[PDB]
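Q: Could you write out the predicted structure for this multi-component system? I'm mainly interested in how the pieces pack against one another.
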Amino acid sequence: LMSLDTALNEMLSRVTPLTAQETLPLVQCFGRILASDVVSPLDVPGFDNSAMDGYAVRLADIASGQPLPVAGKSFAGQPYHGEWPAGTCIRIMTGAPVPEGCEAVVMQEQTEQMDNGVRFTAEVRSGQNIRRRGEDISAGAVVFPAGTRLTTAELPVIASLGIAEVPVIRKVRVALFSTGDELQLPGQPLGDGQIYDTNRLAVHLMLEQLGCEVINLGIIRDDPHALRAAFIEADSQADVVISSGGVSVGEADYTKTILEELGEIAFWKLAIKPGKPFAFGKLSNSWFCGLPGNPVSATLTFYQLVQPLLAKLSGNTASGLPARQRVRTASRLKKTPGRLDFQRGVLQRNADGELEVTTTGHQGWHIFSSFSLGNCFIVLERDRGNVEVGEWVEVEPFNALFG
Amino acid sequence: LMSLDTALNEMLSRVTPLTAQETLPLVQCFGRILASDVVSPLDVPGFDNSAMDGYAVRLADIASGQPLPVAGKSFAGQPYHGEWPAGTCIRIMTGAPVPEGCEAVVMQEQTEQMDNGVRFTAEVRSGQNIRRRGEDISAGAVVFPAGTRLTTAELPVIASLGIAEVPVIRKVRVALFSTGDELQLPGQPLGDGQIYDTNRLAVHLMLEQLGCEVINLGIIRDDPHALRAAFIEADSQADVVISSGGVSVGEADYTKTILEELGEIAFWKLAIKPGKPFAFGKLSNSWFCGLPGNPVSATLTFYQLVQPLLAKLSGNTASGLPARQRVRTASRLKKTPGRLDFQRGVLQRNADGELEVTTTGHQGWHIFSSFSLGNCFIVLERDRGNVEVGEWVEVEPFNALFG
């Protein structure tokens, strides 16, 4: 019934980003969200300097149309600090500080040289090949705004301005547990109708990879007291508590009564596939997400719903999900109207060098192998029925959470 | 003069992957390369179970054509072991062990309630909706091959089989340093012709994200003895040693003679841009890579050369670099034949929903911002000259190192 779009915007609208902060040395900042703007302490470049290697000149002497002899020279960090006789020109090398009153720079290949003067060529427009102090970054200006996810793209710039540490928002804290007498820990023996817990592992690797501090409270026993206890501990030290399975997502039962007792939880029926149910709301001091038991529904719900909510909590201003792109199917896809279907497929180059998707295989939720064989989702529009080789289709490549 | 493909091959062909290994639990394996085939020790599923919420039935009862009182139930972890006499059925939920004698399973929508049992409106085919023990993964099979980098995609399936630990190849150990009296640490004051070291930071951040154990020796002072000792130490506990700036990449000076004294170091001139010079060879017990001084060049060289070298060394069998795709330019590209040019550009969707690249701006190596403003490389073909709006062009999206 309810649409992904609707639920996303209902979730994100209620959430307020964190703002607690700490200050760390740059080498510890990868993935972290700058808490305040970074402002440039210095000019960059720090003085007007030469774009090309060649000759520094006064627009005056260029109308002499007569060789100009080299009075002197200015290199890397050995400026020309002297008299500039009229009718002459300076040899200059890139990164080198222009000389006092220089009006332009000419690449030497645009000026045939000589053994007694420098003969120029194509008119020398003013300012040409001069990089003006603060042209790249002007001191006092805003290099990188608050809310930016720091990376190799940004951290090295910050180091270049001489800054050793920046303020970042604290890592989001998420608490995590599963429940059900059916669940068994790995290495323990599979009882009667029992299965090994996988969703909690799955939710844990993703949280850790998205940068959160995880608090894994393990498998809670099937008891209303064990369970209340677990929520009280989860809520007291996370911004977010996640049930990777077993807690209710709609079906009437005792977990559903503990959840209704401990906060405002809505139970949504999303029009997605795989999946459907998903639980969400406020507890006392945290937000609650509850996932379906199905490994495929869980993984998927977490990735399209929780992932973006953690993004926002983190202070991050960019939406933290990859962009989609339009690509040709190379496989007949089965898709039934009514539902936004996140199938998995494989994005690869054809002979022509253009991009095409193939289905992974069966898209049923009774397996996990689609996540490995795949490398993206084929996001079939809600109303679309079947698709034939060659139709167009939106594709959303997986991120680092899946390889 | 030398080509990227060439050098890359020349590097990869010399390198042997590590095989030393260590055993960790799954929750610590994200990013790790699997050391030995994971072999499934059970069938999956572990027992015939229901694909649906519904009832277990038999074809003979179904055929009578009258309601079947529910003799009992089979849940998630409560497998029904009751009597199940003729003319009855067993309410059964998804994933529940089908009962003994069960010939089929119909879902809700094919079921209409009755006061004297349950009616079955739709046809019941033999075998239907019973996931059969072992149809997904069979015991003794190989689920994931050695060499497979573990991810969210695989680590849960591994837990699904009840394994708590796997052997993985030890992280590759890399040693990092720079040298030169003009290098200043961040926060310290800028001397006369000095600069803030930034390559080293950059390389440390990328290495850490690639999952390497980094050993960061800091700035080595310009002295033949301190530099030698720094090499001898890095070589004695790293598989790879990397100069992020300051050691010769060709140019004549004391760094070069040290290199030449301590290992077999080739000094390439690559036909790429930005950059050219790169340094590579074996020291006594480790590979050594030396990057150019310039920030844009060492980054680009690290990423296109050292990254793949680290991938192979790691044990990983997928070539660890993104794929390229063919895309149209919305920007005129300045390009000179002679050199494979890795420019920086912006991949975005246009109004028709098609992907296209713009330039980020100046492709000059005097600034680093193109890495920030960008989101890919426009890998311009070596012989190509300039490119006009509308031409096809190859693009290689930035990976997680740049966001």
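A: Regarding packing and overall arrangement: The longest strand of chain A covers residues 340-349.
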